[PDB]
């Protein structure tokens, strides 16, 4: 019932897109911090339906490793989405280029990523753009999956549909997305998590594109793990990566079997 600025002090722009902006807002009376996605509803004709879907999906989310959705408001043709603020920023900025991060930190983060992704898959949601730039850290360095702008429901009441839409970010996309006209959602998300783990352990992406026409991807398929990034990765997490970055999605490891992996369950001294 009050103009936005009267209840909220805007502190900083967290990010911007064709969508609009994401801002850090502090409540003037409670002093609580919130991220606010701001969407100009007049940009593009598909804006109402896309934001309807995103709001619905965000209403489904309730997990400690997924950005929480507090609610939505609209002023004129401006739509606000109020979201949990993650003051630690992007997981991307914890990855030292060509180095990565200490193996116990990468294991902890990977545990939290797996918890969030398997939660999403359990309720039938696929995120479809998992990468370190979309994985945020709260003030205690707990990981949170963020930005469900590309997400959709692939399964409900044990009825699953195959996806066909080309989306994501090439270094993180699974090869079947390039090769097949239709594909299951869950192996695609598992593949992108494996790329994220590679980046955390080695500080670099293994290939620009998951294609035979990419030399580094062919090297991986030829098991040339004396090359970077694999040379930087201890053999236990590398064995996990060998099970995840499997080209054939029907032979790719699932998350239940990732939970049984030896490195995944190894206590790591910091």
């Amino acid at each position: 019932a009050v103009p936005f600025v009267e209840d909220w002090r805007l502190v900083q722009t967290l990010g911007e897109g064709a969508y609009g902006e994401v801002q850090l807002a502090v409540n003037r009376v409670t002093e609580e911090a919130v991220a606010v996605k701001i969407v100009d509803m007049k940009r593009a004709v598909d804006c109402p339906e896309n934001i309807k879907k995103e709001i619905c999906i965000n209403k489904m989310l309730n997990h400690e490793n997924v950005v929480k959705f507090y609610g939505h408001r609209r002023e004129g043709n401006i739509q606000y989405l109020f979201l949990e603020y993650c003051s630690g920023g992007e997981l991307f900025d914890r990855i030292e280029p060509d180095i990565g991060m200490p193996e116990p930190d990468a294991q902890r983060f990977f545990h939290q990523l797996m918890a969030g992704v398997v939660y999403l898959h359990g309720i039938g949601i696929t995120h479809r753009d998992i990468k370190p730039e979309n994985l945020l850290l709260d003030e205690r360095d707990n990981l949170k999956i963020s930005d469900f702008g590309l997400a959709t429901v692939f399964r409900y009441n044990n009825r699953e549909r195959l996806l066909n839409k080309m989306c994501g970010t090439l270094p993180y996309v699974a090869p079947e997305l390039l090769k097949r006209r239709e594909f299951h959602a869950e192996p695609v998300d598992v593949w992108s998590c494996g790329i994220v783990l590679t980046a955390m352990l080695a500080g670099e992406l293994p290939w620009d594109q998951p294609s035979d026409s990419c030399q580094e991807y062919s090297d991986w398929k030829e098991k040339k793990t004396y090359l970077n990034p694999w040379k930087k990765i201890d053999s236990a997490p590398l064995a996990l990566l060998h099970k995840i970055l499997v080209e054939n999605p029907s032979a790719r490891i699932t998350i239940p079997d990732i939970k049984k992996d030896r490195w995944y369950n190894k206590p790591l001294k910091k």
């Binding site: 879907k53 039938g124 959709t152």
Partner: peptide, 10 residues
């Protein structure tokens, strides 16, 4: 908005 149709599953 429509989970019974898997959103854009239409």
């Amino acid at each position: 908005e429509e989970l019974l149709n898997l959103c854009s599953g239409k």
